[PDB]
Enzyme design. Structure first.
Site, short mmCIF file in Angstrom:
data_model
loop_
_atom_site.label_atom_id
_atom_site.label_comp_id
_atom_site.label_asym_id
_atom_site.label_seq_id
_atom_site.Cartn_x
_atom_site.Cartn_y
_atom_site.Cartn_z
N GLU A 116 51.31 31.05 50.54
CA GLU A 116 50.99 30.72 51.50
C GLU A 116 49.44 30.19 51.75
O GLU A 116 48.74 29.95 50.91
CB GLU A 116 49.94 33.17 52.11
CG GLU A 116 49.14 32.62 52.98
CD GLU A 116 48.72 34.13 53.78
OE1 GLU A 116 48.50 35.23 52.47
OE2 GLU A 116 48.06 34.43 54.21
N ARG B 245 51.77 38.44 35.97
CA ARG B 245 51.40 37.23 36.93
C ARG B 245 50.59 36.52 35.92
O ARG B 245 49.98 37.70 34.70
CB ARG B 245 50.88 37.23 37.58
CG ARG B 245 49.90 38.86 38.13
CD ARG B 245 49.58 39.01 39.19
NE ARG B 245 48.47 38.20 39.81
CZ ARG B 245 48.55 37.75 41.67
NH1 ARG B 245 49.45 38.12 41.80
NH2 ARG B 245 47.87 37.60 42.03
N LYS C 107 43.15 34.36 44.55
CA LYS C 107 43.34 33.46 45.79
C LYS C 107 41.76 33.97 46.58
O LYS C 107 41.32 33.33 47.00
CB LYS C 107 44.09 32.48 46.42
CG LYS C 107 44.45 31.44 46.75
CD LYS C 107 44.86 31.30 47.92
CE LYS C 107 46.87 31.22 47.92
NZ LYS C 107 47.58 32.70 47.74
N1 LIG Z 1 57.69 37.61 47.51
C1 LIG Z 1 56.28 36.51 46.96
O1 LIG Z 1 56.35 36.02 45.52
C2 LIG Z 1 55.43 36.85 47.40
C3 LIG Z 1 54.95 35.89 48.34
C4 LIG Z 1 53.60 36.13 48.86
N2 LIG Z 1 52.97 35.51 50.00
C5 LIG Z 1 52.59 35.77 47.92
O2 LIG Z 1 52.38 36.13 46.28
N3 LIG Z 1 51.47 35.41 48.36
S1 LIG Z 1 50.65 33.85 46.98
O3 LIG Z 1 50.05 32.78 47.86
O4 LIG Z 1 49.50 34.67 46.44
O5 LIG Z 1 51.37 33.10 46.22
C6 LIG Z 1 51.89 32.62 46.27
C7 LIG Z 1 53.47 32.96 44.95
O6 LIG Z 1 53.27 31.91 43.70
C8 LIG Z 1 52.80 33.35 42.79
N4 LIG Z 1 51.94 33.71 41.84
C9 LIG Z 1 50.93 34.48 42.93
N5 LIG Z 1 49.48 34.39 42.43
C10 LIG Z 1 50.07 34.97 41.33
C11 LIG Z 1 49.41 34.24 39.67
N6 LIG Z 1 47.74 34.98 39.68
N7 LIG Z 1 49.70 34.27 38.49
C12 LIG Z 1 51.34 33.56 38.61
N8 LIG Z 1 51.85 33.23 40.02
C13 LIG Z 1 51.41 34.12 41.04
C14 LIG Z 1 54.00 33.68 42.99
O7 LIG Z 1 55.62 33.21 42.88
C15 LIG Z 1 53.38 34.46 44.62
O8 LIG Z 1 55.22 34.65 44.69
#
Ligand SMILES: NC(=O)CC[C@H](N)C(=O)NS(=O)(=O)OC[C@H]1O[C@@H](n2cnc3c(N)ncnc32)[C@H](O)[C@@H]1O
Length: 529
Positions: free
Chosen positions: A27, A253, A263
Site C-alpha cells: 500500500e 514476516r 511502516k
Molecule cells: N494480502 C497481503 O499481502 C496484504 C497486502 C496489504 N496490502 C499489506 O500488507 N500492506 S503493506 O504495504 O504493509 O505490505 C505490502 C506487502 O509487503 C509484504 N510485507 C508487509 N510487511 C512485511 C514485513 N514486516 N516483512 C515482510 N514482508 C512484509 C507483504 O507481502 C505485504 O502484503
RNA sequence: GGGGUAUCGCCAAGCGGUAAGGCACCGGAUUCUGAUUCCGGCAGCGAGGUUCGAAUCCUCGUACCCCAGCCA
C-alpha cells in the site's frame, strides 16, 4: 526451495496451473523496508524462476493514509533491489468501478446490504473473541432498498461513518472476519489517483481478492496476519461472477533485532524527527539500507539466507551484517582513513614527502595499485598509540615499532601531552629500507573528511515490544567523527563503497557531502575480536 | 473462542529410515588490514500410544503469535 515453491511445483505437475503469476501489493503509505525485500524476493523470484509474471500493485484503497510520494519510492526500491514487474504498474484503484459492480452483484444476490449501525454500534453487535455477534436490524433490507441506499452512499447522500455496505455472512461465525465484514465505506477524501471521483472506498478484504482474480494471480502470497482473512478472500470470490480463483498461501514476516519494522513506527521516527528521514542511514528501510551502503545483492542474499516459513522469527544483525561484508570484502578496494587522529612526527624524516604504492585489493591484485603521498608529519588513529600495553596489543607501544600500512616501520620514542594530559603528538623515527601494523594519513596531503559512525538505532533487541519504542533509541546510533583520509578519496563518487583499512566499509553519504566536506558513511565495521 | 507455530544462541533442512547447510561462536595456520582465507571444534515442548524403527504419524496437555479498524 521452500514450502511455497514446493506447492508451486505440485500445482505445476498436477496441472492445476501452467504458469505462475505472483504479485507484490504494498500500500503506498510509507517506504519499503527490508521486510518488504523479503516479500519482494519471494514473489519476484518465484515468478522469474518459473518463467512467470509478478506485478507491482499499490493496494491504494484507503485514500486518507496514502500519498503519491510513496508510490514513486516503492517503485524505485523495487527496481533498485533488482526486479522488474510484469507489464505496467497496476493500482487497486484501477479496479474501483470493477469493485463497485461486484458490490452490486453481492447486493442483488442479496449477500451484502447497507448497514447503518454507527461505527460504535457495528462493534457492539460484533460480539467478541468468545461471544458470537448479533444481526443488525438493517441486515435484512430488500435488494431494492440496498441498491437504492448503496447508490446514495456512493452519491454522497450520507456523511462519513453514517453508512456502510456490508456482506451478509454469518454474525456468529468464529472467524471475526466473517461477522458481516464491511465492503464499502464513506470517505470524502481526494484519492491520489482518482482525485474526487470517489466518495466511497472499498475495503482491503474485498479489494484484494478481486484484484488478484481480475489480474490472473496464481498464488496470492502474504504474511501470517492474513490467515484468518483467507476465509473472506475465498467467500467474496466464491460469491461473484469472476472466472479464476487464486489460492493464497501465507508465510512468516521478517523481524530484525534492534529495529522496529512497521511502516507505522518507522513512520513515527520520521514525523517526530528522531531520524534524518525514511532514508536516514540507520533505518531498516531499503532507501536507507542503500544510503547506508547496502548492495542490492547483500539484501537479496539476506533474503535468500533466511528462507520463507510459517515459523515466527527474529533475525540477528550479524546476519544482515555478514551479508554486506561478504559482498564488500570481495569487491571494495581498500583505502586509508583515520577516524580519531593524533599527530605523529617522524623527526628522522628529512624532506617533503615521496610516494608510497598501496594496493587497491591485497587478496586480489587484479584491481591494480595506487599512489599515495607518504611523509613524516602524518596522522594515525589514537587507539593505535599506547605508552603501556599487554602482550596482545599489536599497535604502537612507547618503546616499540609498528609497520605503517604500505610504508615504513616507525618507532615511537617520545610523546607529548597537554592540559588535560591527552597527547598532541607522537615523535618517532622511521627505518630506512624496510619495504604490528597500523594505518595512517600524511597530515599534509590529508583530505579533511567527516565520518558518520552508525550503530543499531535501538538500544534493545526488541524495541517493538517496548512500552515506548522511542524511549529506547540508542543516542549513539550515530557518531560523527572528523578525520583525515588519503587524497585518493577526493574522487569518491557517491555510490561505490571503499574499505577504510582496519576500520570498516564506507560509502560517501549522499545526503550531505560537499566538494570540500565529503561525508563517508560507515556501512558496516569489520569483524574485531 | 478461532486461526497458526513449537529442531542448535539466531535462522533453516528433513515430510517414517536412523538429525543438511547459514549466521554467531571457540581452537589452530597463514595475512603489511587483530580482516580476509583457512582447517578443526558444540542439538528436535511434555507426556502417552503407534513402527522393526517416527523430529516428520495418532492423542492428550503445554507454550508463544494473530483475530473483536467503516487500516491494510
Ligand atoms: N494480502 C497481503 O499481502 C496484504 C497486502 C496489504 N496490502 C499489506 O500488507 N500492506 S503493506 O504495504 O504493509 O505490505 C505490502 C506487502 O509487503 C509484504 N510485507 C508487509 N510487511 C512485511 C514485513 N514486516 N516483512 C515482510 N514482508 C512484509 C507483504 O507481502 C505485504 O502484503
Amino acid at each position: 526451495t521452500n514450502f511455497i515453491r514446493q506447492i508451486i511445483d505440485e500445482d505445476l505437475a498436477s496441472g492445476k496451473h501452467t504458469t505462475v503469476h505472483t504479485r507484490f501489493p504494498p500500500e503506498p503509505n510509507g517506504y519499503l523496508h527490508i521486510g518488504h525485500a523479503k516479500s519482494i524476493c519471494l514473489n519476484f523470484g518465484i515468478a522469474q524462476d518459473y518463467k512467470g509474471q509478478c506485478n507491482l500493485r499499490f493496494d491504494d484503497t484507503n485514500p486518507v493514509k496514502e500519498d503519491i510520494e510513496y508510490v514513486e519510492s516503492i517503485k524505485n526500491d523495487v527496481e533498485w533491489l533488482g526486479f522488474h514487474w510484469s507489464g505496467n504498474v497496476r493500482y487497486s484503484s484501477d479496479y474501483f468501478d470493477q469493485l463497485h459492480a461486484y458490490a452490486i452483484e453481492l447486493i442483488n444476490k442479496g449477500l451484502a446490504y447497507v448497514d447503518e449501525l454507527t461505527p460504535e454500534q457495528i462493534r457492539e453487535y460484533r460480539g467478541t473473541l468468545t461471544q458470537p455477534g448479533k444481526n443488525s436490524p438493517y441486515r435484512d433490507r430488500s435488494v431494492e432498498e440496498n441498491l437504492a441506499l448503496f447508490e446514495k452512499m456512493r452519491a454522497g447522500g450520507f456523511e462519513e461513518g453514517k453508512a456502510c455496505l456490508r456482506a451478509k455472512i454469518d454474525m456468529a461465525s468464529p472467524f471475526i472476519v466473517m461477522r458481516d465484514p464491511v465492503l464499502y465505506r464513506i470517505k470524502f477524501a481526494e484519492h491520489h489517483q482518482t482525485g474526487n471521483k470517489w466518495c466511497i472506498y472499498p475495503m482491503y478484504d474485498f479489494t484484494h481478492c478481486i484484484s488478484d482474480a481480475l489480474e490472473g494471480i496464481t498464488h496470492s502470497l502474504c504474511t501470517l496476519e492474513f490467515q484468518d482473512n483467507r476465509r473472506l478472500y475465498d467467500w467474496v470470490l466464491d460469491n461473484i461472477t469472476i472466472p479464476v480463483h487464486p489460492r493464497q498461501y501465507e508465510f512468516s514476516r521478517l523481524n530484525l533485532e534492534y529495529t522496529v519494522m512497521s511502516k507505522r513506527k518507522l513512520n513515527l521516527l520520521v514525523t517526530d524527527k528522531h531520524v534524518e528521514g525514511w532514508d536516514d542511514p540507520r533505518m531498516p528501510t531499503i532507501s536507507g539500507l542503500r544510503r547506508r551502503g547496502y548492495t542490492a545483492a547483500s539484501i537479496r542474499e539476506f533474503c535468500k539466507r533466511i528462507g520463507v516459513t510459517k515459523q515466527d522469527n527474529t533475525i540477528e544483525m550479524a546476519s544482515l551484517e555478514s551479508c554486506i561484508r561478504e559482498d564488500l570484502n570481495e569487491n571494495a578496494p581498500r583505502a586509508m582513513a583515520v577516524i580519531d587522529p593524533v599527530k605523529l612526527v617522524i623527526e628522522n624524516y628529512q624532506g617533503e614527502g615521496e610516494m608510497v604504492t598501496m594496493p587497491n585489493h591485497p587478496n586480489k591484485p587484479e584491481m591494480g595499485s595506487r599512489q599515495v603521498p607518504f611523509s613524516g608529519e602524518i596522522w594515525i588513529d589514537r587507539a593505535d598509540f599506547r605508552e603501556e600495553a599487554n602482550k596482545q596489543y599489536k599497535r604502537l607501544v612507547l618503546g616499540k615499532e609498528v609497520r605503517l600500512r604500505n610504508a615504513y616501520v616507525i618507532k615511537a620514542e617520545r610523546v607529548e601531552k597537554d592540559a588535560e594530559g591527552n597527547i598532541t603528538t607522537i615523535f618517532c623515527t622511521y627505518d630506512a629500507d624496510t619495504l604490528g601494523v597500523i594505518h595512517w594519513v600524511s597530515a599534509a596531503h590529508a583530505l579533511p573528511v567527516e565520518i558518520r559512525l552508525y550503530d543499531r538505532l535501538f538500544s534493545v533487541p526488541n524495541p517493538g515490544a517496548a512500552d515506548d519504542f522511542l524511549s529506547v533509541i540508542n543516542p549513539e546510533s550515530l557518531v560523527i567523527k572528523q578525520g583525515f583520509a588519503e587524497p585518493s578519496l577526493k574522487d569518491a563518487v557517491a555510490g561505490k563503497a571503499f574499505q577504510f583499512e582496519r576500520e570498516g566499509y564506507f560509502c560517501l553519504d549522499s545526503r550531505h557531502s560537499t566538494a570540500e566536506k565529503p561525508v563517508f558513511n560507515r556501512t558496516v565495521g569489520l569483524r574485531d575480536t
